[PDB]
């Protein structure tokens, strides 16, 4: 279980990086929008 | 260990759903 739970870090710091290139990449479009 | 590891995965978690919620309102402005 340690080492599920090692993953599911690894899984959602990846998700949260995602998600941040996600809300620079709209923040982007709403400046030159 | 067990403790601190599922204290993080709560953290980025609620994290995670404070970026997807800020993603959605950005999205609906701009029309995705």
């Known amino acids: 279980r ?3 739970l090692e993953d599911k ?3 959602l710091l990846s998700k949260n ?3 941040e290139n ?3 990449r709209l ?3 709403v ?3």
């Open 27 to 29: 923040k982007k479009l």
């Open 9 to 11: 870090v690894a899984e």
């Open 17 to 19: 990086y995602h998600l």
């Open 2 to 4: 340690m080492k599920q």
């Open 22 to 24: 996600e809300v620079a």
């Open 31 to 33: 400046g030159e929008r």
